[PDB]
Design a protein around this ligand. Structure first.
Ligand SMILES: [Mg+2]
Ligand SMILES: [Mg+2]
Ligand SMILES: [Mg+2]
Ligand SMILES: [Mg+2]
Ligand SMILES: [Mg+2]
Ligand SMILES: [Mg+2]
Ligand SMILES: [Mg+2]
Ligand SMILES: [Mg+2]
Ligand SMILES: [Mg+2]
Ligand SMILES: [Mg+2]
Ligand SMILES: [Mg+2]
Ligand SMILES: [Mg+2]
Ligand SMILES: [Mg+2]
Ligand SMILES: [Mg+2]
Ligand SMILES: [Mg+2]
Ligand SMILES: [Mg+2]
Ligand SMILES: [Mg+2]
Ligand SMILES: [Mg+2]
Ligand SMILES: [Mg+2]
Ligand SMILES: [Mg+2]
Ligand SMILES: [Mg+2]
Ligand SMILES: [Mg+2]
Ligand SMILES: [Mg+2]
Ligand SMILES: [Mg+2]
Ligand SMILES: [Mg+2]
Ligand SMILES: [Mg+2]
Ligand SMILES: [Mg+2]
Ligand SMILES: [Mg+2]
Ligand SMILES: [Mg+2]
Ligand SMILES: [Mg+2]
Ligand SMILES: [Mg+2]
Ligand SMILES: [Mg+2]
Ligand SMILES: [Mg+2]
Lengths: 157, 236, 96, 130
RNA sequence: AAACCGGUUGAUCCUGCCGGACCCGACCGCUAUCGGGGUAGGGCUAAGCCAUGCGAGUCGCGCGCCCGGGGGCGCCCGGGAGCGGCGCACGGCUCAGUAACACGUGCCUAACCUAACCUCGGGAGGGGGACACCCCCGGGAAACUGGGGUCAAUCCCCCAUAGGGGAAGGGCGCUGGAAGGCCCCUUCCCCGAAAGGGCUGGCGGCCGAUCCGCCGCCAGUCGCCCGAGGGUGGGGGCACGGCCCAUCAGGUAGUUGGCGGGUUAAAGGCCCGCCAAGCCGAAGACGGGUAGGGGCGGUGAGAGCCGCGAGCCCCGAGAUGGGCACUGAGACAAGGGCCCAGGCCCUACGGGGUGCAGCAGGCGCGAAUACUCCGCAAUGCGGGCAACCGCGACGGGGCUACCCCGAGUGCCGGGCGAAGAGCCCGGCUUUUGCCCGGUCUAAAAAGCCGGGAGAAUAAGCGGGGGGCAAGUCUGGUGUCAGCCGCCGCGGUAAUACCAGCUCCGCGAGUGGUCGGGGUGUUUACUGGGCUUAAAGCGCCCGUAGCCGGCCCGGCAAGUCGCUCCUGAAAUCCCCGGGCUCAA
């Protein structure tokens, strides 16, 4: 008798104890470097990071036969998004993946890391006002997680 | 009578969520609701000739579509296994055949085998005059004299002439023929009949098919004999 | 629940503390039972009158029972005449 | 007929003897029944054709005078006449009120016969001589 | 992230509760710019009462009549009131009854019916009638309704034959696991079809402009009747599965079964006549309480717990309470009928209507709630040969802090300011707000594309003694007022109250009270404890239950492995793709 409704997708990266000093210090650093809007964006990055790690955890627990069809395609898909660097690492190497690798794929970060803007908050403003063309199309969402192949197509107006 | 989109058969080539809350309901024709597709769905989805339901009804209303030699002007007419669908103004012919992916597919066929339909004998009844009536997998019937109808047992496949209302060729169900699975998980598979575990109910007998050397098993109910090493009519 | 204020009554804080927590007696409309409701905030009792509809709500505390030094009271006033008491106390609105 | 006065639906009693509630408030018309229509001994035959479920028809004998008595020892059928109802083993009150039911004895012209049809349902009295 | 932290002591180790931190659901407070996706909204409250409107029609290719325009061959077209066919038993709403063959899964009907439709085989001959609209009159407040005349049918009826039912005897034969079945033969009884109708074209004949038809035939097409099967819908049956209470222990008497009957479409104590004493129960009857069942949903690392098991889909039941019938394939019928109860409404006092658990809407209750809006374009359905028509189903938007997703409320440099806020200066951009055009949309709206001015139009909520991030800064009060989930403060120097300044958390949100889960190994299967903290019956005999020595042989029930038919869709996990990414 229950009707399904959507739930928050950033809950997996949300800490259940927000009032930790060292926790507040580390997260405040991350928002500063990458110019995020609120902690929801930061938690949304971690929720992606938990997916990549929890999926890799389960694939380790799967049998060798079961792991085989999914092992290489999983690493290859991670490589193409730009999270990882080698798509041929051991599967346990993905377990130590760090949340900054997901934050670098944000479209706002790439505009700043490509020297296309003065500051990271300026690069967010560039995407917001619609001066950043991704393969010729205006992509105005600064939190866009650009994959590897699309990265070289980023231009300004 | 309505048909909610949720209650539509799973294998139908329509989106499950996106669309209206309704689906076109077949009008009790020569098939089963679970194993038939209405004519308006075929004209709109499988052939893509109509973009709306009114356009599909318009195409059907002109008699452009022929199903087994009879022009069907009903947009809720059911189509099913081994049916011959012919589009008059374009001249294309299809035979709805068991498919490994779509579960039921419109395959083009040559014009020669368009009047032929392979029918599986579902049973026989004794009618007045002492004659025998044959019931086929799509509910079609054929009355025969008693001696000729004695030698056609159930599950035998007969190639039926829609043009002459006759039996071209009778294919008995014996071990060693070519069979196609017409229902169940193993649909679309064509292979040799080489193994049977005869149960107390013959319709529930376990049968095995081989294609060198992928072996699939089903029940005896779910396989149609299509002949010896050469299939009699194009199905794949 | 809703209720009608009858008399402004004062209960005394428990032994270690010393104060007169100012509550009111309310009769519930849906039941007719009479309950003692705590009026919070400094001067919040002054916004209460006799025969005014107030929205009665639980005071919190463990297990839905009474609060810390207030003995035997389970409810507190949140609304007076259809306006929130915190709004009146903060000046953001005025009582009707 | 389908009459709620002769409802043929299930009891409200469990096999343990305890009572159970009513799942359905109304009496379904499909589960309805009808009053008896077994014929009475009369001076002429009157047949009534009744429309029943699905647009079908049932032949009702309102008043019975002749019986199609059959002689097993001779293999002949005679449309003999009926004089009295000797006895009704299912219920004597059928014979007491001159009502013919299956299994009843009838003292026909040829002798005695046991009624071998359901005269409220078949609509004729097929009899076999004793 | 498989997590702990506060509090009983002078101090300590425990036990054990209560609190904090998290997610979701309802209601509420303060605040509130934009967009996208979504089956969110009087459910958790009275199945309480209702003003008003809209909510099932369609067919002239079944039928006659009337009217208007046109034309001569035999009519064309438009319209009207009707008869007639089919549909209105689908669709929409709600959750009282129900602890039950209601629901779920897996099987049956060899004990059954089914209009529309599909296939095979066969048939369509003879003869009659009535009633509407209409015309001449009405009656009545209205509802409704009377008499005479008069034209038809795919309207109604009869006759024939086919066919059908029953009883009885026989059989090679069929189906099927198995014939009380089908087929064939014989005897009797009984019931008993049809619309060759419409259209199109061709032929011929009768007839006449006061007719614009009628008749025979042929073909095409849409139809009608019978037999058999299928299909669909439905009636019925079975095995098993899913709440609490013993401060409820015996219950049942058509009750349990048998035989013979009636009724039914069909089996049945469904009902009836007779016969017996059986049937259920501590493996929990009976009684009470609660509840529509499922797909499923929330929460947790999981086992599990809970139902927010309201919204979407499937089944069920209901239409103010309780009953009973007509028609029909199907109802004992939400916008049909009749009766009782209980209301209300109009009235000319003689009557006649009505019950919104339909879509809007009003009153009422309550802590708690939307427009008396637009369209049949999409998705479907009924009707039609078709064209097309209708549809508060459905689609569209409005309102609403409904759920999720993406953003703004500026960016760069400089000075003052503190490295903050803020102020000012110089340069930049226009997401967004405003105006306009194209596109979109049934039409709007919003979206999208493009153009103009412009920093210009846009931040709150809760907190700073510990738990727990944030002030031993200042003013005021002085165990008063106030705070406080717990611990605990305040009685003159208050980091806990009221204020200023300042800082903290989250941010178009943030809080308060509730409910569920975690918390919690405080329900313990995983996985607790019982000497003394709560907890071994005072002791023993034993029924059900649970648990039980060794070896050999058999079966293969459990169990294990593979495969098949299944376990609706949606929901869930993984993978690919398409909306700018996202949802
Ligand atoms: Mg306390
Ligand atoms: Mg835990
Ligand atoms: Mg102490
Ligand atoms: Mg607790
Ligand atoms: Mg309600
Ligand atoms: Mg017609
Ligand atoms: Mg008309
Ligand atoms: Mg009509
Ligand atoms: Mg319904
Ligand atoms: Mg008359
Ligand atoms: Mg007729
Ligand atoms: Mg028969
Ligand atoms: Mg006749
Ligand atoms: Mg006639
Ligand atoms: Mg019987
Ligand atoms: Mg009984
Ligand atoms: Mg609703
Ligand atoms: Mg009633
Ligand atoms: Mg009714
Ligand atoms: Mg009502
Ligand atoms: Mg439409
Ligand atoms: Mg958001
Ligand atoms: Mg400075
Ligand atoms: Mg517009
Ligand atoms: Mg503040
Ligand atoms: Mg302060
Ligand atoms: Mg601290
Ligand atoms: Mg505090
Ligand atoms: Mg314990
Ligand atoms: Mg002892
Ligand atoms: Mg004791
Ligand atoms: Mg013992
Ligand atoms: Mg076994």
């Amino acid at each position: 008798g229950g009707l399904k409704k959507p739930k928050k997708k950033y809950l997996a990266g949300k800490p259940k104890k927000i009032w930790n000093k060292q926790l507040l210090l580390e997260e405040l650093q991350l928002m500063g470097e990458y110019g995020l809007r609120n902690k929801k964006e930061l938690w949304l990055a971690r929720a992606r990071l938990k997916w990549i790690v929890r999926r890799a955890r389960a694939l380790l627990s799967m049998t060798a036969e079961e792991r085989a069809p999914l092992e290489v395609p999983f690493k290859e898909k991670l490589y193409k998004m730009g999270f990882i660097e080698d798509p041929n690492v051991p599967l346990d190497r993905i377990l130590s993946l760090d949340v900054r690798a997901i934050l670098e794929r944000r479209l706002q970060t790439l505009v700043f890391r490509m020297g296309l803007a003065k500051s990271i908050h300026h690069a967010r403003q560039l995407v917001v006002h619609g001066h950043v063309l991704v393969a010729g199309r205006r992509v105005t969402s600064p939190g866009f997680l650009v994959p590897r192949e699309l990265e070289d197509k980023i231009t300004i107006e | 009578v309505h048909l909610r989109k949720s209650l539509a058969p799973y294998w139908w080539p329509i989106p499950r969520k996106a669309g209206g809350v309704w689906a076109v309901r077949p009008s009790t024709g020569p098939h089963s609701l679970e194993y038939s597709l209405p004519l308006a769905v075929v004209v709109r989805d499988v052939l893509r000739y109509a973009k709306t339901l009114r356009e599909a009804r318009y195409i059907i209303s002109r008699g452009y579509i022929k199903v087994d030699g009879v022009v069907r002007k009903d947009y809720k007419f059911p189509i099913g296994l081994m049916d011959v669908v012919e589009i008059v103004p374009t001249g294309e012919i299809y035979r709805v055949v068991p498919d490994e992916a779509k579960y039921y597919d419109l395959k083009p066929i040559p014009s020669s085998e368009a009047a032929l339909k392979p029918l599986r004998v579902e049973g026989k009844t004794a009618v007045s005059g002492g004659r025998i009536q044959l019931h086929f997998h799509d509910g079609r019937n054929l009355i025969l004299p008693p001696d000729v109808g004695r030698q056609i047992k159930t599950f035998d496949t007969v190639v039926y002439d829609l043009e002459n209302k006759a039996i071209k060729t009778h294919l008995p169900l014996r071990l060693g023929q070519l069979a196609v699975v017409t229902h169940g998980g193993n649909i679309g598979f064509v292979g040799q009949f080489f193994e049977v575990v005869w149960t107390l109910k013959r319709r529930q007998s376990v049968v095995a098919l081989r294609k060198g050397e992928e072996v699939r098993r089903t029940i005896l109910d779910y396989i149609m004999v299509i002949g010896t090493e050469a299939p009699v009519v194009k199905i794949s | 629940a809703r209720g009608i204020v009858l008399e402004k009554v004062g209960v005394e804080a428990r032994k270690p503390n010393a104060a007169v927590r100012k509550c009111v007696r309310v009769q519930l409309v849906k039941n007719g039972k009479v309950v003692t409701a705590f009026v919070p905030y400094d001067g919040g009792l002054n916004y209460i009158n006799e025969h005014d509809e107030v929205i009665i709500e639980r005071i919190g505390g463990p297990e839905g029972k009474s609060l810390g030094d207030i003995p035997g009271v389970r409810f507190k006033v949140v609304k007076v005449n259809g306006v929130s008491l915190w709004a009146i106390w903060r000046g953001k609105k005025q009582k009707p | 007929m389908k009459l709620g006065a002769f409802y043929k639906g299930g009891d409200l009693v469990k096999p343990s003897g305890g009572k159970k509630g009513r799942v359905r408030k109304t009496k379904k018309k499909a589960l309805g029944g009808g009053p008896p229509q077994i014929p009475k001994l009369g001076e002429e035959d009157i047949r009534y054709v009744e429309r029943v479920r699905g647009g079908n028809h049932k032949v009702r004998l309102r008043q019975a005078r002749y019986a199609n008595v059959y002689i097993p020892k001779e293999r002949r059928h005679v449309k003999a006449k009926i004089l009295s109802i000797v006895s009704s083993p299912s219920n004597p009150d059928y014979a007491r009120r001159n009502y013919i039911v299956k299994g009843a004895i009838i003292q026909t012209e040829v002798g005695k016969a046991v009624v071998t049809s359901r005269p409220g349902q078949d609509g004729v009295i097929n009899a076999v001589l004793i």
